[PDB]
Amino acid sequence: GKDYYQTLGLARGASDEEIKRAYRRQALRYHPDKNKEPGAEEKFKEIAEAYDVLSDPRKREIFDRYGEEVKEFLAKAKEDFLKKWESPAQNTAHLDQFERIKTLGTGSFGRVMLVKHKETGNHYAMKILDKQKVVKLKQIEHTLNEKRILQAVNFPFLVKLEFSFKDNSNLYMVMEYVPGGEMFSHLRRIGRFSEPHARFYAAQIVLTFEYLHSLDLIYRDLKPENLLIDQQGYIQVTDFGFAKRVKGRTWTLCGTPEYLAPEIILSKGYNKAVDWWALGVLIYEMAAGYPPFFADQPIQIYEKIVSGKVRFPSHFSSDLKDLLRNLLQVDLTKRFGNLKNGVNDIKNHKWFATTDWIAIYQRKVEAPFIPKFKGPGDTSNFDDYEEEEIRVSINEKCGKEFSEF
Amino acid sequence: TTYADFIASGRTGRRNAIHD
Ligand SMILES: Nc1ncnc2c1ncn2[C@@H]1O[C@H](COP(=O)(O)OP(=O)(O)OP(=O)(O)O)[C@@H](O)[C@H]1O
Ligand SMILES: [Zn+2]
Ligand SMILES: [Zn+2]
Ligand SMILES: [Zn+2]
Numbered sequence: 001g002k003d004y005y006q007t008l009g010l011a012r013g014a015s016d017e018e019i020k021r022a023y024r025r026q027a028l029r030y031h032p033d034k035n036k037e038p039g040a041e042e043k044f045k046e047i048a049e050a051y052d053v054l055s056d057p058r059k060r061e062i063f064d065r066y067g068e069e070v071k072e073f074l075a076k077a078k079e080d081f082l083k084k085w086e087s088p089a090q091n092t093a094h095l096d097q098f099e100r101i102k103t104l105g106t107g108s109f110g111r112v113m114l115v116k117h118k119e120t121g122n123h124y125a126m127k128i129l130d131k132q133k134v135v136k137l138k139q140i141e142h143t144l145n146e147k148r149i150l151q152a153v154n155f156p157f158l159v160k161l162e163f164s165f166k167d168n169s170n171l172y173m174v175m176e177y178v179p180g181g182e183m184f185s186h187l188r189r190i191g192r193f194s195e196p197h198a199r200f201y202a203a204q205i206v207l208t209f210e211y212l213h214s215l216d217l218i219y220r221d222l223k224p225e226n227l228l229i230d231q232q233g234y235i236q237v238t239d240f241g242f243a244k245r246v247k248g249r250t251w252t253l254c255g256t257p258e259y260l261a262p263e264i265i266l267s268k269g270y271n272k273a274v275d276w277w278a279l280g281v282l283i284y285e286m287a288a289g290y291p292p293f294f295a296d297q298p299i300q301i302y303e304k305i306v307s308g309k310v311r312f313p314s315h316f317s318s319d320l321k322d323l324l325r326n327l328l329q330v331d332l333t334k335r336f337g338n339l340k341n342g343v344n345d346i347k348n349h350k351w352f353a354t355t356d357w358i359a360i361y362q363r364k365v366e367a368p369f370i371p372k373f374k375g376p377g378d379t380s381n382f383d384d385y386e387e388e389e390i391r392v393s394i395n396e397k398c399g400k401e402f403s404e405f
Numbered sequence: 406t407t408y409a410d411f412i413a414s415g416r417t418g419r420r421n422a423i424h425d
């Protein structure tokens with residue numbers, strides 16, 4: 001994801017002399033003894049790298065083909081999403097096929113239980129939603145989106161929705177079970193992650209948001225509570241409860257207080273930039289051990305967010321602070337992720353200079369942290385929750401509201 | 406210190422989404 005042509009200010013079909021002339025022009029501009037502004041040095045190097053590729057016919061051809069490969073990969077990803085989105089899977093299991101073992105986690109809307117498939121012995125994580133509660137909390141459209149979207153996406157860091165079904169009382173979403181627990185509990189116990197450790201997680205979220213956004217999807221509930229650690233130490237994003245397909249802007253006030261972008265708080269029509277703001281909060285909390293805006297009452301949290309005055313621990317690197325100033329940018333029109341160069345302003349930021357983006361995508365990087373275990377059903381990486389009886393009424397509830405589920 | 410203030414604060418536990 002480097003834009004060599006744009007770096008030199010060129011069109012894709014530029015000639016060799018145009019490439020030479022553009023490199024020379026751009027070079028003079030950032031030359032170390034005629035430009036001593038911050039990061040001019042880093043641009044002087046980027047212009048040289050772009051020239052070395054484009055000025056060599058073999059390497060330029062490789063780069064041009066790679067641009068075509070990426071476009072074709074995106075076309076297949078859009079195809080796969082649209083086919084699944086336009087004709088959603090339904091009714092792919094039912095309740096008494098699963099032995100319910102233990103509650104793994106709860107949220108504002110649902111209960112997630114470790115279950116075991118009676119026939120195969122395989123373990124899964126089943127999210128249970130009470131239809132009447134969903135209606136009361138005004139989450140009908142959100143819950144319909146959640147299921148429809150999660151089973152239509154496919155990415156290495158997105159949890160898989162394996163089965164779904166419904167009965168008189170409840171909605172059920174049966175996911176792959178991610179056994180290493182929430183990032184949240186590890187982060188709180190450990191205190192904070194070192195910058196390379198935080199960067200490892202951050203890079204997975206960057207690729208995941210690049211993927212979702214390329215399908216016109218926004219996620220809207222990034223937080224360590226919704227991030228699970230798998231057996232290889234990689235991230236699995238769960239909780240698509242606020243995921244939505246948006247071309248243009250959307251208007252719902254939703255999210256989790258510490259992670260709300262300012263434009264959501266100010267009731268503005270907002271877009272994919274809110275996900276990039278949330279990434280700033282996540283990276284800050286991962287590396288500091290506490291979020292950039294906190295207070296006892298969410299009203300006071302919201303007042304801090306929209307001022308967006310932010311202070312950094314003195315142990316934060318200069319590159320980390322610079323990245324965070326650009327992600328935690330209160331003006332969405334200036335926020336990294338939302339500029340002309342899109343996700344590349346982030347991927348090519350200095351703080352990510354050591355990140356091998358293709359190796360992260362391929363899961364070839366050794367994780368900084370591997371969760372401990374003691375068996376295929378061990379749950380000790382999760383807190384304990386009070387257990388509650390799953391009751392199914394003899395009368396169907398909210399039949400019309402959830403017809404498409 | 407700020408981390409000290411945070412771990413002695415009221416919002417160190419899991420944060421559920423807003424239902425508003
Ligand atoms: N696939 C999974 N594997 C293991 N545990 C999971 C999985 N999905 C969710 N959990 C656990 O269940 C918890 C609640 O699930 P989820 O966040 O989807 O519920 P919610 O009601 O939508 O919460 P929120 O208040 O964040 O909107 C998660 O925080 C996590 O601990
Ligand atoms: Zn397909
Ligand atoms: Zn198992
Ligand atoms: Zn997975």
Ligand SMILES: [Zn+2]
Nearest residue numbers: 193194197368
């Ligand atoms: Zn660490």
Ligand SMILES: [Zn+2]
Nearest residue numbers: 107225226239
């Ligand atoms: Zn959640």
Ligand SMILES: [Zn+2]
Nearest residue numbers: 107239241422
């Ligand atoms: Zn949720």
Ligand SMILES: [Zn+2]
Nearest residue numbers: 137423424425
């Ligand atoms: Zn409520």
Ligand SMILES: [Zn+2]
Nearest residue numbers: 108137424425
């Ligand atoms: Zn309440």
Ligand SMILES: [Zn+2]
Nearest residue numbers: 422423424425
């Ligand atoms: Zn309330």
